[PDB]
Structures are given as structure tokens and as C-alpha cells.
Amino acid sequence: KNVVIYADGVYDMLHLGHMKQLEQAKKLFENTTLIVGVTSDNETKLFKGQVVQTLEERTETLKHIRWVDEIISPCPWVVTPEFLEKYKIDYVAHDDIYAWLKRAGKFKATQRTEGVSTTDLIVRILKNY
Amino acid sequence: KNVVIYADGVYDMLHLGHMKQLEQAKKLFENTTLIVGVTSDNETKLFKGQVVQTLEERTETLKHIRWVDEIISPCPWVVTPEFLEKYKIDYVAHDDIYAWLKRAGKFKATQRTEGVSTTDLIVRILKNY
């Protein structure tokens, strides 16, 4: 009955967009365990670019989010078939922005919300001057 | 057994500091219902000053926070004895930064965390130039 869902990401400066995505992963099935993976500082910089919060800071905030059942921190940068067996993961929940996951029936797309970013709010604050 | 806890605030640009405070209110007793009250835009401006997110935006984010059981939105700006009977509230959980609540045994102080503000993060981002 219980389905294990894995959602990895940077989760830098967590905002409403991240939270809706996690909500959606959590509710992919009736009974879920949602595991969130938080990428390491070094790897994020190496492939994504500058991260603002540390691994510890990004992991901390996620502990307060209703939908999160377990955290792997830090998590591997790329998911592997062995990683999935290790943690008994049934589906990987990520945005479509991976072929092998779809081929195996293990990919669940989750959607993004624009205009919700911490970056977006300061633009609003400044637009007062 | 179950204790109703009321925590009101603006909750503008929610950050780790707010979340720890809500955690603390939630865990004041073994079995709690935590009610969060979100002040109205107009009243917040009238007494606090400029608010950045709308009532709807501040209420939305709180729906994703693990510790929050119910939301009153908008909530009255000042708590009243009648408001407490209305919602069967046993303790008001707020920071000490109110005499009548203490006198009645209904005040539970909750602490703040500094350096955790959305405001604090941009200062870090800019300190790169």
C-alpha cells in the first residue's frame, strides 16, 4: 500500500514553488513516504552554479515542511538504479525541465509555479523606489 | 488531553525563525492543536508598517508548514477574552517583545532566532560584489 517517493533538488532559499512541488510528490499516491534529497554544496556549485544557503541551512528549512517524511542529506547528484534499491524507492518525483526512469515506469513528473521566488519578492520591495 | 494553542503574527516572507517559533508553540504540550492567526493587510500597515506579501500570500505559505494545524485568516489584530472562548483557545503562544494573558495563566512565551531572515540572505548574496 505505501509507496516510497524520492524528490531530489537543491532547495536553495525554499519558496512556495518548492513547497507545492513537494506537496504534489507527496500526494502522487494515497499512502506515500516522501524522501527528499538535498544536493551537496560542492556538487551544486560544480554543475548548477552558485548556491546561496549551505547544505545545513537548506536541510534545516525542509525539516519544517509538512509534506517531507524523510531527508537524505547530502544526496547523490545523479540518481542511480542502485540508489533506488538501497532506499526501496518506487518513484522519483522531479520536474521535466531520466529517460531510463521513464522506461522503467519509475518517473513521476511534478510541476513548477512561477512568480513565487524569494528573488521575485525583493523586486517587489524595490519597486517602491 | 488536547491543548489548543493560538499563535498570531504577520508571517510576512516566512523564514526559518518563524518556523522554529511555530515548532515551539506546537510542542508546548504533548497533545496540541496549534491555531495560527494571520493579521490583515490593512491593520498590519496601520500598526506595524509596510507588509510585503498579501494576506493571501502569507496564508498560503503557512499551509505548507508541518506544525500548523488550523489557520484563522485574517485574524483580529489584538486578542480578546471573547476571541479565546470562541475558538476554545487554552494558551496564546507569542514572543515577549499580554499582562492580562499572563495574569490568567494563558500566556506561553516563544523565542526568536536572529540572522535567519529573508532580509539576511540577500545581504549575503550582495556581499559577493
- What is the residue extent of each domain of chain B? 3-126
Inter-chain contact B64–A67, Cβ cutoff 8 Å? yes
Of A16, A122, A128, the CB nearest to B61: A16
CA-to-CA distance for B33 and B25, rounded, in angstroms?
Answer: 10
Which helix (H) or strand (E) segment holds residue A59: the answer is: helix A55-62
Helix axes A118-126, B118-126, angle to 10 degrees: 90
The residue among B4, B118, B14 whose CA lies nearest residue B63 is B14
Name the maximum alpha-carbon separation found in chain A.
55
Residue in the structure block whose three cell numbers are 549551505: A54
Find the farthest-apart pair of alpha carbons in chain B and give their distance in angstroms, rounded: 55
| B11 three-state secondary structure | coil
Going from the C-alpha of A57 to that of each of A41, A121, B65, B123, the distances in angstroms are 11, 20, 16, 16
Pick the CATH number of B3-126 from 3.40.50.10580, 3.30.1490.20, 3.40.50.620, 3.40.50.720: 3.40.50.620
User: Which residue matches cell numbers 497533545?
Assistant: B31
Number of H helices, E strands in chain A: 6, 5
The helix (run of H) or strand (run of E) holding residue A9 is strand A3-9
Q: Which amino acid is at A8?
A: D
What distance in Å separates the CA atoms of residue B42 and residue B118, rounded to the nearest whole number? 22
Question: Which of A51, A49, A72, A118 minimizes the C-alpha distance to B16?
Answer: A118
Q: Residue B56: helix, strand or coil by DSSP?
A: helix
**What distance in Å separates the CA atoms of residue B54 and residue B41, rounded to the nearest whole number?**
6
**A 36-65 → B contacts, CB under 8 A:** 50, 52-53, 57, 60-61, 63-65
Which cell is B97 given?
Answer: 517583545
